[PDB]
mmCIF file of C-alpha atoms and ligand atoms in Angstrom:
data_model
loop_
_atom_site.group_PDB
_atom_site.id
_atom_site.type_symbol
_atom_site.label_atom_id
_atom_site.label_comp_id
_atom_site.label_asym_id
_atom_site.label_seq_id
_atom_site.Cartn_x
_atom_site.Cartn_y
_atom_site.Cartn_z
ATOM 1 C CA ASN A 1 20.278 0.554 -43.796
ATOM 2 C CA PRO A 2 17.259 -0.263 -45.763
ATOM 3 C CA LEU A 3 15.102 -0.609 -42.549
ATOM 4 C CA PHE A 4 15.400 3.171 -42.290
ATOM 5 C CA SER A 5 14.311 4.059 -45.859
ATOM 6 C CA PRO A 6 10.704 5.518 -45.663
ATOM 7 C CA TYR A 7 7.687 3.546 -46.763
ATOM 8 C CA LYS A 8 4.370 4.738 -47.754
ATOM 9 C CA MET A 9 1.560 2.339 -46.320
ATOM 10 C CA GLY A 10 -1.439 3.786 -48.072
ATOM 11 C CA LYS A 11 -1.847 7.220 -46.526
ATOM 12 C CA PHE A 12 0.777 6.531 -43.770
ATOM 13 C CA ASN A 13 4.289 7.946 -44.469
ATOM 14 C CA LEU A 14 6.385 5.698 -42.241
ATOM 15 C CA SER A 15 9.740 6.890 -41.430
ATOM 16 C CA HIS A 16 11.141 3.501 -41.027
ATOM 17 C CA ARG A 17 10.156 -0.415 -41.376
ATOM 18 C CA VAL A 18 10.590 -1.455 -37.815
ATOM 19 C CA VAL A 19 7.071 -2.758 -36.605
ATOM 20 C CA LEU A 20 5.976 -3.420 -33.180
ATOM 21 C CA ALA A 21 4.494 -7.081 -33.604
ATOM 22 C CA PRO A 22 1.150 -7.603 -31.843
ATOM 23 C CA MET A 23 1.885 -9.347 -28.429
ATOM 24 C CA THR A 24 -0.350 -10.403 -25.550
ATOM 25 C CA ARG A 25 1.038 -9.230 -22.355
ATOM 26 C CA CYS A 26 -1.931 -9.682 -19.823
ATOM 27 C CA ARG A 27 -1.762 -6.432 -18.249
ATOM 28 C CA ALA A 28 -5.016 -5.308 -19.218
ATOM 29 C CA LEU A 29 -6.632 -6.193 -15.775
ATOM 30 C CA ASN A 30 -10.313 -7.471 -16.182
ATOM 31 C CA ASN A 31 -10.178 -6.769 -19.762
ATOM 32 C CA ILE A 32 -9.852 -2.865 -19.397
ATOM 33 C CA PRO A 33 -7.014 -1.126 -21.064
ATOM 34 C CA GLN A 34 -4.861 0.090 -18.137
ATOM 35 C CA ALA A 35 -2.463 3.115 -17.901
ATOM 36 C CA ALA A 36 0.258 0.786 -18.071
ATOM 37 C CA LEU A 37 -0.472 -0.219 -21.681
ATOM 38 C CA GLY A 38 -0.235 3.481 -22.339
ATOM 39 C CA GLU A 39 3.305 3.866 -20.877
ATOM 40 C CA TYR A 40 4.321 0.648 -22.653
ATOM 41 C CA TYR A 41 3.130 1.605 -26.003
ATOM 42 C CA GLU A 42 4.361 5.223 -25.521
ATOM 43 C CA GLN A 43 7.905 3.916 -24.755
ATOM 44 C CA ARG A 44 8.156 1.996 -27.966
ATOM 45 C CA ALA A 45 6.355 4.672 -30.162
ATOM 46 C CA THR A 46 8.379 6.437 -32.475
ATOM 47 C CA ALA A 47 7.783 9.181 -35.044
ATOM 48 C CA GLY A 48 6.766 7.392 -38.280
ATOM 49 C CA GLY A 49 6.773 4.076 -36.619
ATOM 50 C CA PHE A 50 3.871 1.575 -36.881
ATOM 51 C CA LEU A 51 2.680 -0.270 -33.784
ATOM 52 C CA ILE A 52 0.107 -3.067 -33.711
ATOM 53 C CA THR A 53 -1.699 -3.575 -30.386
ATOM 54 C CA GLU A 54 -1.840 -6.783 -28.447
ATOM 55 C CA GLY A 55 -4.578 -9.121 -29.501
ATOM 56 C CA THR A 56 -7.961 -7.587 -28.249
ATOM 57 C CA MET A 57 -11.135 -9.205 -27.532
ATOM 58 C CA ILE A 58 -14.163 -8.718 -29.836
ATOM 59 C CA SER A 59 -16.758 -10.368 -27.578
ATOM 60 C CA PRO A 60 -17.178 -11.886 -24.011
ATOM 61 C CA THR A 61 -16.452 -15.305 -25.773
ATOM 62 C CA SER A 62 -13.376 -14.361 -27.415
ATOM 63 C CA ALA A 63 -10.440 -14.610 -24.841
ATOM 64 C CA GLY A 64 -8.195 -17.544 -23.854
ATOM 65 C CA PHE A 65 -5.656 -15.418 -21.933
ATOM 66 C CA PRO A 66 -6.171 -13.541 -18.384
ATOM 67 C CA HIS A 67 -6.222 -9.814 -18.458
ATOM 68 C CA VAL A 68 -6.144 -9.284 -22.382
ATOM 69 C CA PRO A 69 -7.832 -5.921 -23.216
ATOM 70 C CA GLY A 70 -11.259 -5.879 -25.080
ATOM 71 C CA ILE A 71 -12.650 -3.352 -27.408
ATOM 72 C CA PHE A 72 -16.246 -4.643 -27.519
ATOM 73 C CA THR A 73 -17.500 -2.346 -24.512
ATOM 74 C CA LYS A 74 -17.641 1.546 -24.641
ATOM 75 C CA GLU A 75 -15.885 1.497 -21.425
ATOM 76 C CA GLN A 76 -12.781 -0.343 -23.096
ATOM 77 C CA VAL A 77 -13.164 2.212 -26.005
ATOM 78 C CA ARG A 78 -12.860 5.028 -23.566
ATOM 79 C CA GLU A 79 -9.593 3.624 -22.102
ATOM 80 C CA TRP A 80 -8.159 2.705 -25.457
ATOM 81 C CA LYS A 81 -8.479 6.488 -26.577
ATOM 82 C CA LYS A 82 -6.226 7.486 -23.989
ATOM 83 C CA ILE A 83 -3.645 4.985 -24.954
ATOM 84 C CA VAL A 84 -4.125 5.793 -28.617
ATOM 85 C CA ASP A 85 -3.653 9.458 -27.886
ATOM 86 C CA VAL A 86 -0.353 9.166 -26.120
ATOM 87 C CA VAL A 87 1.047 7.106 -29.025
ATOM 88 C CA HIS A 88 -0.229 9.596 -31.666
ATOM 89 C CA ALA A 89 1.419 12.317 -29.657
ATOM 90 C CA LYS A 90 4.852 10.699 -30.405
ATOM 91 C CA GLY A 91 3.973 10.607 -34.105
ATOM 92 C CA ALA A 92 3.419 6.770 -34.370
ATOM 93 C CA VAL A 93 0.648 4.835 -36.311
ATOM 94 C CA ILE A 94 -1.016 2.173 -34.491
ATOM 95 C CA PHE A 95 -3.571 -0.632 -35.286
ATOM 96 C CA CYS A 96 -5.721 -2.759 -32.867
ATOM 97 C CA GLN A 97 -5.310 -6.507 -33.282
ATOM 98 C CA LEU A 98 -8.865 -8.053 -33.121
ATOM 99 C CA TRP A 99 -8.446 -11.566 -31.619
ATOM 100 C CA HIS A 100 -10.774 -14.347 -31.000
ATOM 101 C CA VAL A 101 -9.279 -17.644 -29.866
ATOM 102 C CA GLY A 102 -11.904 -20.100 -30.822
ATOM 103 C CA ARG A 103 -11.049 -23.370 -29.178
ATOM 104 C CA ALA A 104 -8.077 -22.080 -27.518
ATOM 105 C CA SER A 105 -9.806 -21.367 -24.396
ATOM 106 C CA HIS A 106 -11.076 -22.688 -21.050
ATOM 107 C CA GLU A 107 -14.270 -22.520 -18.783
ATOM 108 C CA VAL A 108 -12.481 -20.196 -16.438
ATOM 109 C CA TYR A 109 -12.411 -17.647 -19.480
ATOM 110 C CA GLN A 110 -15.883 -18.161 -20.681
ATOM 111 C CA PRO A 111 -19.146 -16.565 -19.724
ATOM 112 C CA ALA A 112 -20.975 -18.928 -17.224
ATOM 113 C CA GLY A 113 -18.081 -21.403 -17.851
ATOM 114 C CA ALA A 114 -19.555 -22.402 -21.198
ATOM 115 C CA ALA A 115 -17.475 -24.410 -23.899
ATOM 116 C CA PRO A 116 -15.427 -22.503 -26.264
ATOM 117 C CA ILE A 117 -16.604 -22.160 -29.689
ATOM 118 C CA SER A 118 -14.701 -23.400 -33.140
ATOM 119 C CA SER A 119 -15.236 -24.705 -36.517
ATOM 120 C CA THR A 120 -14.762 -28.298 -34.821
ATOM 121 C CA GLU A 121 -15.622 -30.281 -31.813
ATOM 122 C CA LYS A 122 -12.028 -31.606 -31.711
ATOM 123 C CA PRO A 123 -10.106 -30.100 -28.701
ATOM 124 C CA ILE A 124 -6.403 -29.142 -28.868
ATOM 125 C CA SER A 125 -4.536 -31.994 -27.678
ATOM 126 C CA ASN A 126 -2.764 -32.473 -24.284
ATOM 127 C CA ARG A 127 0.560 -31.396 -25.667
ATOM 128 C CA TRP A 128 -0.520 -27.905 -25.435
ATOM 129 C CA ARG A 129 -1.321 -26.378 -22.253
ATOM 130 C CA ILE A 130 -3.416 -23.147 -21.591
ATOM 131 C CA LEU A 131 -2.173 -20.524 -18.928
ATOM 132 C CA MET A 132 -4.689 -20.156 -16.045
ATOM 133 C CA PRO A 133 -5.552 -16.977 -14.061
ATOM 134 C CA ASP A 134 -3.298 -18.404 -11.200
ATOM 135 C CA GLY A 135 -0.408 -18.758 -13.103
ATOM 136 C CA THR A 136 -0.607 -22.638 -13.317
ATOM 137 C CA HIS A 137 -1.498 -24.455 -16.721
ATOM 138 C CA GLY A 138 -4.810 -26.196 -17.599
ATOM 139 C CA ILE A 139 -6.165 -28.538 -20.144
ATOM 140 C CA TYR A 140 -7.910 -27.207 -23.109
ATOM 141 C CA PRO A 141 -11.306 -28.483 -23.325
ATOM 142 C CA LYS A 142 -13.908 -29.855 -26.073
ATOM 143 C CA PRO A 143 -14.995 -26.984 -27.875
ATOM 144 C CA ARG A 144 -18.614 -26.487 -29.478
ATOM 145 C CA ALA A 145 -18.890 -26.411 -33.263
ATOM 146 C CA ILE A 146 -20.815 -23.277 -34.602
ATOM 147 C CA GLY A 147 -23.342 -23.235 -37.237
ATOM 148 C CA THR A 148 -23.705 -20.621 -39.986
ATOM 149 C CA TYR A 149 -25.827 -18.365 -38.113
ATOM 150 C CA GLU A 150 -23.584 -18.216 -35.215
ATOM 151 C CA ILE A 151 -20.720 -17.703 -37.768
ATOM 152 C CA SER A 152 -22.545 -14.521 -38.965
ATOM 153 C CA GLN A 153 -22.522 -13.350 -35.434
ATOM 154 C CA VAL A 154 -19.044 -13.844 -34.479
ATOM 155 C CA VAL A 155 -18.487 -11.919 -37.910
ATOM 156 C CA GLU A 156 -20.671 -9.075 -36.637
ATOM 157 C CA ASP A 157 -18.587 -8.958 -33.366
ATOM 158 C CA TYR A 158 -15.539 -8.493 -35.679
ATOM 159 C CA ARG A 159 -17.628 -5.604 -37.475
ATOM 160 C CA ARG A 160 -18.689 -3.916 -34.179
ATOM 161 C CA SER A 161 -15.181 -4.211 -32.563
ATOM 162 C CA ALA A 162 -13.646 -2.592 -35.871
ATOM 163 C CA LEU A 163 -16.112 0.285 -35.531
ATOM 164 C CA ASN A 164 -15.144 0.608 -31.854
ATOM 165 C CA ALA A 165 -11.449 0.620 -32.585
ATOM 166 C CA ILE A 166 -11.877 3.591 -35.165
ATOM 167 C CA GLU A 167 -14.050 5.246 -32.372
ATOM 168 C CA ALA A 168 -11.316 4.958 -30.067
ATOM 169 C CA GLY A 169 -8.910 6.653 -32.510
ATOM 170 C CA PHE A 170 -6.883 3.807 -34.010
ATOM 171 C CA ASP A 171 -5.540 4.259 -37.470
ATOM 172 C CA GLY A 172 -6.915 0.726 -38.319
ATOM 173 C CA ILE A 173 -7.393 -2.880 -37.303
ATOM 174 C CA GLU A 174 -5.554 -6.051 -37.713
ATOM 175 C CA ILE A 175 -7.530 -9.308 -38.215
ATOM 176 C CA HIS A 176 -5.688 -12.057 -36.170
ATOM 177 C CA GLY A 177 -6.108 -14.926 -38.624
ATOM 178 C CA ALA A 178 -2.909 -16.801 -37.454
ATOM 179 C CA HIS A 179 -1.415 -19.109 -34.691
ATOM 180 C CA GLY A 180 -4.196 -21.890 -34.365
ATOM 181 C CA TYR A 181 -6.851 -19.208 -33.291
ATOM 182 C CA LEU A 182 -10.559 -19.236 -34.406
ATOM 183 C CA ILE A 183 -9.920 -17.957 -38.040
ATOM 184 C CA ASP A 184 -7.058 -20.586 -38.366
ATOM 185 C CA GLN A 185 -9.345 -23.210 -36.899
ATOM 186 C CA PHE A 186 -11.533 -22.664 -40.130
ATOM 187 C CA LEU A 187 -8.441 -22.214 -42.470
ATOM 188 C CA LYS A 188 -6.382 -25.160 -41.429
ATOM 189 C CA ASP A 189 -7.402 -28.827 -42.748
ATOM 190 C CA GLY A 190 -5.899 -30.497 -39.635
ATOM 191 C CA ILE A 191 -8.518 -28.798 -37.674
ATOM 192 C CA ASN A 192 -11.601 -28.092 -40.284
ATOM 193 C CA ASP A 193 -13.450 -31.378 -40.192
ATOM 194 C CA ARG A 194 -16.507 -29.472 -41.413
ATOM 195 C CA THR A 195 -18.795 -30.937 -44.276
ATOM 196 C CA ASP A 196 -20.984 -28.025 -44.906
ATOM 197 C CA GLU A 197 -20.001 -24.804 -46.903
ATOM 198 C CA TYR A 198 -17.201 -23.887 -44.451
ATOM 199 C CA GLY A 199 -15.207 -27.028 -44.770
ATOM 200 C CA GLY A 200 -13.428 -29.344 -47.090
ATOM 201 C CA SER A 201 -12.288 -27.429 -50.354
ATOM 202 C CA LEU A 202 -9.702 -24.580 -50.075
ATOM 203 C CA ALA A 203 -12.495 -22.038 -51.072
ATOM 204 C CA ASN A 204 -14.711 -23.361 -48.079
ATOM 205 C CA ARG A 205 -12.140 -23.201 -45.594
ATOM 206 C CA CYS A 206 -11.291 -19.627 -46.695
ATOM 207 C CA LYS A 207 -14.968 -18.699 -46.279
ATOM 208 C CA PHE A 208 -14.833 -17.478 -42.593
ATOM 209 C CA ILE A 209 -11.700 -15.237 -43.160
ATOM 210 C CA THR A 210 -13.180 -13.718 -46.157
ATOM 211 C CA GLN A 211 -16.543 -13.117 -44.739
ATOM 212 C CA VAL A 212 -14.659 -11.505 -41.534
ATOM 213 C CA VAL A 213 -12.560 -9.167 -43.726
ATOM 214 C CA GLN A 214 -15.287 -8.244 -46.043
ATOM 215 C CA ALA A 215 -17.366 -7.209 -42.955
ATOM 216 C CA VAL A 216 -14.610 -4.869 -41.725
ATOM 217 C CA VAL A 217 -13.625 -3.537 -44.912
ATOM 218 C CA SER A 218 -17.319 -2.576 -45.410
ATOM 219 C CA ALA A 219 -17.527 -0.996 -41.931
ATOM 220 C CA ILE A 220 -14.417 0.927 -42.035
ATOM 221 C CA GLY A 221 -12.640 0.998 -45.269
ATOM 222 C CA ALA A 222 -10.162 -1.246 -46.867
ATOM 223 C CA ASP A 223 -7.192 1.135 -46.267
ATOM 224 C CA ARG A 224 -7.625 0.600 -42.556
ATOM 225 C CA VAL A 225 -7.646 -3.044 -42.319
ATOM 226 C CA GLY A 226 -4.631 -5.442 -42.094
ATOM 227 C CA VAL A 227 -4.647 -9.293 -42.226
ATOM 228 C CA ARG A 228 -2.346 -11.578 -40.416
ATOM 229 C CA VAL A 229 -2.069 -15.318 -41.132
ATOM 230 C CA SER A 230 0.451 -18.030 -40.408
ATOM 231 C CA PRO A 231 0.071 -20.937 -42.836
ATOM 232 C CA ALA A 232 3.211 -22.891 -41.687
ATOM 233 C CA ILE A 233 2.916 -22.387 -38.128
ATOM 234 C CA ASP A 234 1.383 -25.571 -36.253
ATOM 235 C CA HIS A 235 0.829 -23.746 -32.926
ATOM 236 C CA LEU A 236 -2.093 -25.602 -31.026
ATOM 237 C CA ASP A 237 -2.513 -28.382 -33.426
ATOM 238 C CA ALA A 238 -3.236 -26.180 -36.395
ATOM 239 C CA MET A 239 -1.583 -27.847 -39.231
ATOM 240 C CA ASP A 240 -2.323 -27.980 -42.859
ATOM 241 C CA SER A 241 -1.457 -30.508 -45.251
ATOM 242 C CA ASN A 242 -0.187 -27.825 -47.901
ATOM 243 C CA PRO A 243 0.750 -24.601 -45.917
ATOM 244 C CA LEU A 244 1.921 -23.167 -49.356
ATOM 245 C CA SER A 245 -1.159 -23.878 -51.072
ATOM 246 C CA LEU A 246 -3.317 -22.750 -48.377
ATOM 247 C CA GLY A 247 -1.430 -19.423 -48.014
ATOM 248 C CA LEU A 248 -1.830 -18.866 -51.847
ATOM 249 C CA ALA A 249 -5.419 -19.671 -51.376
ATOM 250 C CA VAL A 250 -5.857 -16.951 -48.757
ATOM 251 C CA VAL A 251 -3.844 -14.438 -50.740
ATOM 252 C CA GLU A 252 -6.142 -15.139 -53.734
ATOM 253 C CA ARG A 253 -9.070 -14.167 -51.701
ATOM 254 C CA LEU A 254 -7.489 -10.984 -50.325
ATOM 255 C CA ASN A 255 -6.623 -9.683 -53.757
ATOM 256 C CA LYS A 256 -10.133 -10.369 -54.856
ATOM 257 C CA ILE A 257 -11.450 -8.636 -51.889
ATOM 258 C CA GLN A 258 -9.204 -5.380 -53.033
ATOM 259 C CA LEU A 259 -10.589 -5.738 -56.602
ATOM 260 C CA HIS A 260 -14.232 -5.960 -55.634
ATOM 261 C CA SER A 261 -14.122 -3.171 -52.822
ATOM 262 C CA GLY A 262 -11.910 -1.028 -54.999
ATOM 263 C CA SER A 263 -9.302 -0.234 -52.329
ATOM 264 C CA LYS A 264 -6.388 -1.993 -51.254
ATOM 265 C CA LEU A 265 -6.108 -3.446 -47.547
ATOM 266 C CA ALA A 266 -3.460 -1.698 -45.201
ATOM 267 C CA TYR A 267 -1.192 -4.940 -45.613
ATOM 268 C CA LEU A 268 -0.844 -8.643 -45.233
ATOM 269 C CA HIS A 269 1.130 -9.778 -42.354
ATOM 270 C CA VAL A 270 2.644 -13.357 -42.343
ATOM 271 C CA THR A 271 4.411 -15.177 -39.510
ATOM 272 C CA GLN A 272 6.779 -17.820 -40.070
ATOM 273 C CA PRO A 273 8.062 -20.591 -37.796
ATOM 274 C CA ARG A 274 11.176 -19.360 -35.925
ATOM 275 C CA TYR A 275 13.141 -22.110 -37.146
ATOM 276 C CA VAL A 276 12.807 -20.680 -40.620
ATOM 277 C CA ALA A 277 14.645 -17.618 -39.678
ATOM 278 C CA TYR A 278 17.212 -19.423 -38.032
ATOM 279 C CA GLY A 279 17.847 -21.317 -41.120
ATOM 280 C CA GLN A 280 18.289 -17.994 -42.993
ATOM 281 C CA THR A 281 21.323 -16.883 -40.836
ATOM 282 C CA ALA A 282 11.765 -19.850 -46.380
ATOM 283 C CA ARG A 283 10.604 -19.607 -50.091
ATOM 284 C CA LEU A 284 6.982 -19.627 -48.461
ATOM 285 C CA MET A 285 7.297 -15.968 -47.188
ATOM 286 C CA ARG A 286 8.574 -14.797 -50.500
ATOM 287 C CA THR A 287 5.984 -16.701 -52.591
ATOM 288 C CA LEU A 288 3.081 -15.230 -50.653
ATOM 289 C CA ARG A 289 4.535 -11.862 -50.966
ATOM 290 C CA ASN A 290 4.958 -12.192 -54.725
ATOM 291 C CA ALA A 291 1.333 -13.297 -54.978
ATOM 292 C CA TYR A 292 -0.173 -10.609 -52.746
ATOM 293 C CA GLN A 293 -1.064 -7.197 -54.383
ATOM 294 C CA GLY A 294 0.070 -4.798 -51.756
ATOM 295 C CA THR A 295 2.096 -4.167 -48.504
ATOM 296 C CA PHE A 296 3.729 -7.140 -46.961
ATOM 297 C CA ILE A 297 4.951 -7.480 -43.281
ATOM 298 C CA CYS A 298 7.271 -10.416 -42.468
ATOM 299 C CA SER A 299 7.354 -11.767 -38.827
ATOM 300 C CA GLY A 300 8.936 -14.522 -37.071
ATOM 301 C CA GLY A 301 12.347 -14.727 -35.489
ATOM 302 C CA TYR A 302 13.678 -11.712 -37.297
ATOM 303 C CA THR A 303 16.804 -9.940 -36.219
ATOM 304 C CA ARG A 304 18.619 -6.648 -37.400
ATOM 305 C CA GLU A 305 20.469 -8.756 -39.968
ATOM 306 C CA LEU A 306 17.570 -10.503 -41.125
ATOM 307 C CA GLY A 307 15.079 -7.627 -41.061
ATOM 308 C CA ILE A 308 17.649 -5.706 -43.285
ATOM 309 C CA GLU A 309 18.036 -8.449 -45.651
ATOM 310 C CA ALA A 310 14.167 -8.945 -45.940
ATOM 311 C CA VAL A 311 13.754 -5.468 -47.174
ATOM 312 C CA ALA A 312 16.738 -5.166 -49.210
ATOM 313 C CA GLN A 313 16.027 -8.473 -51.085
ATOM 314 C CA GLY A 314 12.344 -7.558 -51.702
ATOM 315 C CA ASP A 315 11.069 -10.284 -49.285
ATOM 316 C CA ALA A 316 9.065 -7.644 -47.273
ATOM 317 C CA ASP A 317 8.049 -3.888 -47.074
ATOM 318 C CA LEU A 318 7.863 -3.862 -43.330
ATOM 319 C CA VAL A 319 9.462 -6.198 -40.793
ATOM 320 C CA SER A 320 7.658 -6.674 -37.336
ATOM 321 C CA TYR A 321 9.677 -7.649 -34.197
ATOM 322 C CA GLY A 322 8.136 -9.505 -31.158
ATOM 323 C CA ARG A 323 10.221 -10.571 -28.366
ATOM 324 C CA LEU A 324 13.128 -8.109 -28.916
ATOM 325 C CA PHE A 325 10.602 -5.505 -28.658
ATOM 326 C CA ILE A 326 9.402 -6.548 -25.284
ATOM 327 C CA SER A 327 12.873 -6.007 -23.844
ATOM 328 C CA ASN A 328 14.087 -3.164 -25.794
ATOM 329 C CA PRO A 329 11.798 -0.121 -25.700
ATOM 330 C CA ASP A 330 13.867 1.778 -28.186
ATOM 331 C CA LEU A 331 14.326 -1.223 -30.387
ATOM 332 C CA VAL A 332 13.983 1.106 -33.478
ATOM 333 C CA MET A 333 17.018 3.251 -32.297
ATOM 334 C CA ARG A 334 18.971 0.178 -31.349
ATOM 335 C CA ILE A 335 18.564 -1.328 -34.721
ATOM 336 C CA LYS A 336 19.387 2.112 -36.155
ATOM 337 C CA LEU A 337 22.766 2.348 -34.244
ATOM 338 C CA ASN A 338 23.243 -1.520 -34.250
ATOM 339 C CA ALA A 339 23.516 -1.071 -30.497
ATOM 340 C CA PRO A 340 23.284 -4.263 -27.980
ATOM 341 C CA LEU A 341 19.996 -5.483 -27.392
ATOM 342 C CA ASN A 342 18.570 -6.252 -23.881
ATOM 343 C CA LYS A 343 17.799 -10.007 -23.168
ATOM 344 C CA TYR A 344 14.000 -10.540 -22.664
ATOM 345 C CA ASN A 345 12.632 -12.618 -19.517
ATOM 346 C CA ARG A 346 10.151 -15.102 -20.592
ATOM 347 C CA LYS A 347 8.836 -15.268 -16.848
ATOM 348 C CA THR A 348 7.107 -11.873 -17.040
ATOM 349 C CA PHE A 349 5.732 -12.081 -20.600
ATOM 350 C CA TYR A 350 2.191 -12.924 -19.146
ATOM 351 C CA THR A 351 2.360 -11.662 -15.552
ATOM 352 C CA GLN A 352 -0.031 -8.774 -14.231
ATOM 353 C CA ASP A 353 2.517 -6.278 -12.769
ATOM 354 C CA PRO A 354 2.106 -2.821 -14.526
ATOM 355 C CA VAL A 355 5.781 -2.210 -14.341
ATOM 356 C CA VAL A 356 8.022 -5.399 -13.706
ATOM 357 C CA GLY A 357 8.835 -6.891 -16.859
ATOM 358 C CA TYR A 358 6.768 -4.589 -18.687
ATOM 359 C CA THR A 359 7.795 -0.991 -18.689
ATOM 360 C CA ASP A 360 11.287 -1.318 -16.699
ATOM 361 C CA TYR A 361 13.311 -2.583 -19.476
ATOM 362 C CA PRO A 362 15.999 0.110 -19.900
ATOM 363 C CA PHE A 363 16.549 2.533 -22.714
ATOM 364 C CA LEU A 364 19.927 3.100 -24.319
HETATM 365 N N1 WI6 B 401 -1.054 -15.049 -31.412
HETATM 366 C C1 WI6 B 401 -0.848 -15.266 -30.016
HETATM 367 O O1 WI6 B 401 -1.712 -14.743 -29.400
HETATM 368 C C2 WI6 B 401 0.177 -15.678 -29.476
HETATM 369 C C3 WI6 B 401 0.103 -16.384 -28.058
HETATM 370 C C4 WI6 B 401 1.276 -17.177 -27.753
HETATM 371 C C5 WI6 B 401 2.406 -17.328 -28.654
HETATM 372 N N2 WI6 B 401 2.234 -17.021 -29.860
HETATM 373 C C6 WI6 B 401 3.048 -17.828 -30.903
HETATM 374 O O2 WI6 B 401 2.907 -19.189 -30.628
HETATM 375 C C7 WI6 B 401 3.996 -19.798 -31.112
HETATM 376 C C8 WI6 B 401 4.516 -20.782 -29.892
HETATM 377 O O3 WI6 B 401 4.738 -19.968 -28.735
HETATM 378 P P1 WI6 B 401 5.562 -20.430 -27.614
HETATM 379 O O4 WI6 B 401 6.734 -20.999 -28.177
HETATM 380 O O5 WI6 B 401 6.000 -19.141 -26.605
HETATM 381 O O6 WI6 B 401 4.640 -21.360 -26.802
HETATM 382 P P2 WI6 B 401 3.525 -21.132 -25.629
HETATM 383 O O7 WI6 B 401 2.504 -22.083 -25.745
HETATM 384 O O8 WI6 B 401 3.459 -19.621 -25.351
HETATM 385 O O9 WI6 B 401 4.455 -21.930 -24.416
HETATM 386 C C9 WI6 B 401 4.931 -18.834 -31.688
HETATM 387 O O10 WI6 B 401 4.839 -18.736 -32.986
HETATM 388 C C10 WI6 B 401 4.582 -17.596 -30.848
HETATM 389 O O11 WI6 B 401 4.902 -16.536 -31.412
HETATM 390 C C11 WI6 B 401 0.893 -16.504 -30.560
HETATM 391 C C1 FMN B 402 4.611 -12.991 -25.432
HETATM 392 C C2 FMN B 402 4.013 -13.027 -26.810
HETATM 393 C C3 FMN B 402 2.886 -12.612 -27.180
HETATM 394 C C4 FMN B 402 2.380 -12.687 -28.391
HETATM 395 N N1 FMN B 402 1.055 -12.349 -28.726
HETATM 396 C C5 FMN B 402 0.667 -12.221 -30.018
HETATM 397 C C6 FMN B 402 -0.817 -11.793 -30.147
HETATM 398 O O1 FMN B 402 -1.480 -11.365 -29.333
HETATM 399 N N2 FMN B 402 -1.018 -11.957 -31.491
HETATM 400 C C7 FMN B 402 -0.322 -12.177 -32.613
HETATM 401 O O2 FMN B 402 -0.880 -12.115 -33.784
HETATM 402 N N3 FMN B 402 0.829 -12.447 -32.181
HETATM 403 C C8 FMN B 402 1.403 -12.763 -31.027
HETATM 404 N N4 FMN B 402 2.812 -13.070 -30.772
HETATM 405 C C9 FMN B 402 3.471 -13.521 -31.883
HETATM 406 C C10 FMN B 402 4.246 -12.133 -32.229
HETATM 407 O O3 FMN B 402 3.204 -11.165 -32.796
HETATM 408 C C11 FMN B 402 5.361 -12.251 -33.340
HETATM 409 O O4 FMN B 402 4.829 -12.959 -34.388
HETATM 410 C C12 FMN B 402 6.540 -13.237 -32.746
HETATM 411 O O5 FMN B 402 6.774 -12.742 -31.456
HETATM 412 C C13 FMN B 402 7.564 -12.676 -33.677
HETATM 413 O O6 FMN B 402 8.774 -13.491 -33.462
HETATM 414 P P1 FMN B 402 9.855 -12.808 -32.815
HETATM 415 O O7 FMN B 402 9.492 -12.873 -31.319
HETATM 416 O O8 FMN B 402 11.147 -13.479 -32.931
HETATM 417 O O9 FMN B 402 10.035 -11.094 -33.228
HETATM 418 C C14 FMN B 402 3.134 -13.139 -29.540
HETATM 419 C C15 FMN B 402 4.390 -13.414 -29.014
HETATM 420 C C16 FMN B 402 4.922 -13.647 -27.603
HETATM 421 C C17 FMN B 402 6.239 -14.000 -27.526
#
């Protein structure tokens, strides 16, 4: 089983290639990492396995879900350290995903009820709804388009949050540049209607993700930085006229960051739409992997069978699993043994109970 051949991710000697994908679960009450997160990540930690945390706030204005953890306060750093310590005691590697939602927010999640920020003033359309703190769904509002100075301020929020993650003991961070959130709002030409140096050409639309990655690389070292993108996923009205071209343009920038800095990133992590994985039971994921000089993590609809094939065929070095890892704490062992998998319950994906639907999925 090629998922269980060892893989060297930079300095980390991973014992297998099954990765916990980052997933928002909304158990970090009032944005403080809770003891429940410690139990949840400990359940899923394995010796030599790689874990990526749920998306984590980089600033008071970066959230678009309730009770998502932050890492922009020293208090949050203190609580994360206890979670990281428990995961490390099980021999796992863990990166903190740094997440700014951009226009995918709501007055209820913003300080003083202010407008969410974005590359544009266009809102997400009404065919997407936002989860509210009381469990209902609301309307995405009009965002405020930020200028170049404020862009540099958001870049500094990523930098400070990366330093805080290292202070908490994380082995690295992952830049969330996918799924229609703030970075993707600069990448995707269906969203980026700017006419300044951050809009228009592929080079200009890639400016923001390049500045973010460069800032964190210069703060904590390239080896501790992973980057996640999703050029073909249209979540939250985030469409590009040429996803392959946009994806290659991003890979181009990452390769050059690595050349200039003198060190490779931890990895590039790409999610594909779930319908692509269903058809495999496309060439986009392989094309990005072939173009990127370093470690490649594939994600999006993967199964045990599709994961094995991805690694065997050379389509990826690592395979991250989301929904199956929610309901299977010991997903790694179930995949090793080809054991049955627990069904996952979508109703408790984003609820606040520290146990129900979170840590009470049973082991084999
Ligand atoms: N990146 C994040 O923070 C995730 C938050 C929500 C769901 N994520 C992704 O959005 C896409 C659509 O999610 P779903 O189908 O669950 O739609 P919802 O708006 O959650 O209802 C999928 O690629 C999924 O993996 C992204
Ligand atoms: C409930 C839920 C929360 C998620 N939260 C995040 C997130 O915070 N950051 C991120 O990059 N992706 C997030 N994702 C997407 C997953 O990381 C991953 O790409 C996806 O679940 C992989 O497909 P799979 O569920 O078929 O394995 C989330 C997905 C789900 C279902």
